[PDB]
Amino acid sequence: GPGAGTVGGFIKRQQSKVVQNKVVYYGVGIWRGFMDGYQVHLEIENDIGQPPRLRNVTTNCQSSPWDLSIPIRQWAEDMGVTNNQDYSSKSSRGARYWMHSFRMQGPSKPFGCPVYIIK
Ligand SMILES: CN1CN([C@@H]2O[C@H](COP(=O)(O)OP(=O)(O)OP(=O)(O)O)[C@@H](O)[C@H]2O)c2nc(N)[nH]c(=O)c21
């Protein structure tokens, strides 16, 4: 169901180390791929010990980017990525939507992760 067909991968891998026989990721990661035919760019970040946070969504889906909320939520579930953190003061101007709790709102609700549209 959700996320069916999503394909992509990290173009910028997070930094990593092995702690207690487990890999731990930290720093900035950039994932790029396709969802429903559209290009999607997702950035995550965390310090060592904090779960990765969704800090940027960029897509070429201009006509209905809200249709990406379900596959982004599923991608994030698979990855352990959270969407509670507010990046509104740390983001470049030009966001067209904001994602928080994996739901999308328009520019009058600037809280959470910015959603940029590029084509
Ligand atoms: C680079 N990776 C890989 N990875 C986790 O490992 C899964 C498989 O990643 P992969 O890109 O297929 O393999 P890869 O890490 O390149 O393996 P290898 O380099 O040993 O060949 C990913 O779906 C994800 O769960 C990651 N998870 C987080 N949070 N951040 C990251 O940068 C990365």
Please report, for the chain, the start and end positions of each structural domain, with discontinuous segments joined by +.
Answer: 1-119
DSSP secondary structure letter of residue 102: T
Rounded to whole angstroms, the Cα distance separating 117 from 88 reads 16
71 alpha carbon to ligand 1 midpoint, in Å?
A: 19
- Count of CB atoms within 10 A of residue 38's CB? 18
Shortest-distance atom of ligand 1 to CA 9: 11
Q: How far apart are CA 113 and CA 92, in angstroms?
A: 11
Q: How many whole angstroms from 54 Cα to the centroid of ligand 1?
A: 16
User: Cα-flanking dihedrals φ and ψ of residue 60, to 5°?
Assistant: -95, 10
Distance between CA 11 and CA 41 in Å, rounded?
10
Between strands 38-46 and 97-100, the pairing is: unpaired
Which of 75, 64, 56 lies closest to 7 in space, CA to CA? 75
Residue 92 DSSP symbol: -
